[PDB]
């Protein structure tokens, strides 16, 4: 039983690992490649798709999901196996990569033929191939997401796929993995642990308060999967002591899966399924309003506050965002609240550092408006959790984020009596 990393290899995107075993060859995620690495997703995976026998998919994130097409694209005609929700949510999620998306490395016909194949495994059902026995656990990460605990040869292997972040509120909490002979896990916050949630939230009413009541902006990039409906979530909570606003989400594509959560509530933790229970969607707070197309989206640079905007791209790669903060930036009435990790050198970090202009969308824009970094709302296990988590396990593999953050960990982890290494592309490891 060898377990061989075909993406994530000191890196956060193209996760996808080949395991080899019972005389089978099971794929553990296809997700693309991202940002700089992007152009990846063209070159060859690295081994023959056409002798894969199954697929599995922890969760609908681009980043595991994203090169499924493509492995179709190449032969391959077998199964994939995600749990209801990913099956559901992954459809918005190709469907959009397809659309917006300038170099396409795989086109409608490999999305459809792509989904296909999909077929629904939920958490604790065993797969069976050849004497493989393979089984999904409760990750926490989006809705339907697991880890992967794989059986076989008398010897258990376990993927982490990504680990959520235990103390928000919307999913459930991560599942312990079982004791195993090899972890394979992520470590995209390997060197630092979260900022407590319930601070965070706390932060966050007093910034929307001041905002709204002196009639500003409060403006939030986030990601369309599961950041914003999760802000929406905080704002229906607690929407009760807010000033009276709109809340404008300006993503057609935070729509169409805001849209689908009610066809997901056992997908969420209790607190959630209780709400839905009682005949509410927690999702909906009051003033909601999904914006489709530009020209309203537009309008709402020129309209002045009160208004809460939610808009993508969450790392301000592009989208609709960058024009709200263009025109908004320039207002000391107005907000900028970040609630999911802005990288190095990119143009969040840069207005984080509080530079007197930013240059958005050809233009330098003075930035008067107030900044706010929401840490708590960041979405994997923080490196306390991940030390939890992979606790009482004998050899770990390390895939998921960048060398550095995935070393601090290793560190932590060799001070533990915990054999620990750094995945590496193409090289297989053995269970
Ligand atoms: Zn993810
Ligand atoms: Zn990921």
Not at 32 to 47: C, D, I, L, Y
Not at 270 to 295: D, I, M, S
Request: hydrophobic content about 40%; charged content about 25%; proline content about 7%.
């Amino acid at each position: 039983m060898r377990i061989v990393p075909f993406g994530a290899a000191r890196e956060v995107t193209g996760s996808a690992h080949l395991l080899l075993a019972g005389g089978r060859r099971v794929l553990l995620d296809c997700g693309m490649f991202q940002g700089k690495e992007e152009a990846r997703n063209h070159a060859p995976f690295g081994f023959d798709p056409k002798e894969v026998d199954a697929v599995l998919l922890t969760h609908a994130h681009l980043d595991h999901v994203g090169r499924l097409p493509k492995l179709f694209r190449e032969g391959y005609r077998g199964p994939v196996y995600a749990t209801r929700a990913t099956v559901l949510l992954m459809e918005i999620v190709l469907e959009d990569a397809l659309k917006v998306m300038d170099e396409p490395f795989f086109g409608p016909e490999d999305v459809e033929e792509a989904l296909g194949h999909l077929r629904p495994l939920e958490y604790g059902e065993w797969l069976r191939l050849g004497a493989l026995s393979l089984a999904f656990g409760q990750a926490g990460h989006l809705p339907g997401s697991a880890f992967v605990v794989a059986q076989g040869e008398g010897r258990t292997l376990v993927y982490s796929g990504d680990l959520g972040n235990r103390e928000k509120d919307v999913l459930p909490d991560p599942s312990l993995p079982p004791l195993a002979d090899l972890v394979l896990a992520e470590g995209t916050y390997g060197d630092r642990p979260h900022r407590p949630y319930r601070e965070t939230v706390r932060e966050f009413l007093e910034i929307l308060e001041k905002t709204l009541s002196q009639g500003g902006k409060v403006l939030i990039p986030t990601f369309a999967v599961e950041r914003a409906q999760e802000i929406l979530y905080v704002l229906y909570t607690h929407g009760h002591r807010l000033p009276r606003a709109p809340i404008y989400l300006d993503s057609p594509m935070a729509g169409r899966v805001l849209s689908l959560y009610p066809r997901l509530v056992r997908y969420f933790s209790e607190e959630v399924q209780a709400h839905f229970l009682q005949g509410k969607n927690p999702f909906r707070p009051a003033g909601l309003e999904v914006v489709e197309h530009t020209e309203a989206s537009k309008a709402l640079n020129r309209a002045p506050g009160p208004m809460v905007v939610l808009a993508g791209s969450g790392m301000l790669a592009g989208g609709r965002i960058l024009h709200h903060l263009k025109h908004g930036l320039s207002d000391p009435r107005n907000a900028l609240v970040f609630v999911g990790y802005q990288p190095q050198g990119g143009l969040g970090a840069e207005i984080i550092a509080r530079p007197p202009a930013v240059r958005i969308l050809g233009e330098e824009v003075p930035l008067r408006a107030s900044v706010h970094t929401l840490g708590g709302f960041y979405g994997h296990a923080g490196q306390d959790e991940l030390l939890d988590w992979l606790q009482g396990e004998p050899r770990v593999v390390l895939v998921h984020g960048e060398e550095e953050k995935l070393l601090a960990l290793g560190k932590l982890l060799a001070l533990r009596g915990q054999e620990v290494s750094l995945a590496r592309f193409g090289e297989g490891v053995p269970v």
